[PDB]
Design an enzyme around this catalytic site. Structure first.
Site, short mmCIF file in Angstrom:
data_model
loop_
_atom_site.label_atom_id
_atom_site.label_comp_id
_atom_site.label_asym_id
_atom_site.label_seq_id
_atom_site.Cartn_x
_atom_site.Cartn_y
_atom_site.Cartn_z
N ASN B 186 0.80 -1.23 0.00
CA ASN B 186 0.00 0.00 0.00
C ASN B 186 0.84 1.29 0.00
O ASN B 186 0.31 2.37 0.27
CB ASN B 186 -0.97 0.01 1.18
N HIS B 188 3.17 2.21 2.10
CA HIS B 188 3.47 2.70 3.43
C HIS B 188 4.77 2.06 3.93
O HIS B 188 5.05 0.92 3.58
CB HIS B 188 2.32 2.36 4.39
N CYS B 223 6.15 7.30 9.07
CA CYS B 223 7.22 7.94 8.30
C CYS B 223 6.80 7.81 6.84
O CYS B 223 6.40 6.73 6.39
CB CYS B 223 8.57 7.28 8.56
#
Ligand code: UV1
Ligand code: UV1
Lengths: 264, 265
Positions: B186, B188, B223
């Site tokens: 995804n 991330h 992050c």
């Protein structure tokens, strides 16, 4: 996994993991590269090499990659079983070659293929040596006698000469440093990290709209745990790119390659 | 792998790979963390999850890690089979808990254990929320009814409060950026990357002479793919203990905090 009936190649099935896949829910090229290494390593253990011979060990000699070429037609999906067949071949005094064939375990169709050229180096001086008669004898018994190539075609992309990228590069990713997870069990930067580092300078829009079909990589020098790298890319065209990894400071070339990407 | 006889936990065996091991020829903590994620994910699939429920997808709600705690007694060697058992538990309206037990497949001895706390969050606004009764009902059917804890002890390190590292840090690793292999499906940054990033500021001499026994990590902020991180470490202690902090290189916004415990080899 296990060696084939003749003992001249090794086969192993892998189930694709959740953390091994990209945005497209299929294995990344780095996951594929890790799998080629795992199957090559398990083949080395099954024939008593664990990939030094006894004569290479009594001489401080090691096998090092000079070229790696991977061609993927279909990336396995998260959960699929990929079967990989691998084998080695002697190339006279030049070095060894290791080849791989990737198949879909359900259909039996070939979904990928790789080829790698390996050279003899002294672990200490790093001076490359030509393969001696004794080493060839210890190796040849675990290799097919007739030639067996993953890339047999007359004039194929696996044997093409790669030029040096001229400044200025079209795209770049600067300041890349290897972390502890990029090191192998001998504290050396793993070959897969270089593939990821090469791909860092490809624009995200190319990655989002295209799939990687081919990657040829030439290894010129090892990157140390304390070195910093710049990854450079220029389009040479399907989309084709020319790549260059060089040390951030002095600009010493560590790698060069080409990639080919097809539209989705 | 497969769900147990009762359907209230999942088991899976893994063979340790050549590229998964460190200098000691045993699986790294990042390999272990990847395996906990793989077994947790396969358990989610085996019971019909994405791990979102029908109501969570209808509300754009997702599960996010708040705390991760791992304790390894023995790291499996390259080639060994490690068996992992995992299960989820509801913690009222606070969130879910996921626990793991690692065993040596040949001896049956427990070689490790992990615990993780998860919280509900809107995917768009990033706003946290207490779990609703409709969501609790869809989850509880796949959870043990009586409590089942990987860390049951009356006083256990998995529930200790972690303080903030004060400047100046004793050790640091500056300018860490996530690459494409640090991103999940995804896009991330993966939670295993934070573990590796925390460990980057531990001195190489500590790593060479000690083995990691415990790691507790508190997740404060995500992050982004374009963010740059600083990893900070100070010794707080036979055994060696450290306090860690991940913060964004620029503004200094805290992204993570944790503690590690290392014993002499
Ligand atoms: C690309 O394949 C790699 C890369 C690095 C290490 C190995 C291998 C497999 C063949 C040789 C081996 O034993 N290990
Ligand atoms: C630490 O475990 C992780 C981390 C990241 C993602 C997942 C998991 C397992 C439980 C939830 C899941 O399905 N996926």
């Amino acid at each position: 996994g296990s060696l084939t009936e003749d003992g001249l190649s090794y086969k192993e099935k892998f189930v694709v993991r959740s953390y091994e896949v990209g945005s497209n829910k299929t294995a990344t090229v780095e996951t594929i590269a890790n799998l080629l290494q795992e199957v090559g390593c398990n083949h080395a253990q099954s024939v008593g090499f664990s990939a030094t011979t006894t004569t290479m060990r009594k001489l401080h000699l090691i096998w090092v990659t000079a070229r790696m070429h991977i061609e993927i037609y279909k990336y396995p999906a998260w959960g699929d079983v990929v079967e990989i067949e691998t084998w080695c071949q002697s190339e006279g005094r030049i070095g060894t070659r290791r080849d791989w064939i990737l198949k879909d375990s359900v259909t039996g169709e070939v979904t990928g293929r790789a080829t790698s050229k390996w050279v003899m180096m002294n672990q200490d001086t790093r001076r490359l040596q030509k393969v001696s008669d004794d080493v060839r004898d210890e190796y040849l018994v675990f290799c097919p006698q007739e030639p067996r190539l993953a890339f047999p075609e007359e004039n194929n992309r696996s044997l093409k000469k790669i030029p040096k990228l001229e400044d200025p590069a079209q795209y770049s990713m600067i300041g890349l440093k290897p972390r502890r997870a990029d090191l192998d069990m001998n504290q050396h930067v793993n070959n897969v990290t270089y593939i990821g580092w090469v791909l860092e300078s490809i624009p995200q829009e190319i990655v989002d709209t295209h799939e990687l079909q081919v990657i040829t990589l030439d290894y010129r020098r090892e990157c140390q745990q304390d070195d910093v790298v710049d990854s450079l890319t220029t389009t040479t065209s399907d989309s084709q790119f020319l790549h260059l990894l060089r040390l951030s400071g002095d600009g010493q070339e560590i790698n060069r390659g080409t990639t080919l990407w097809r539209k989705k």
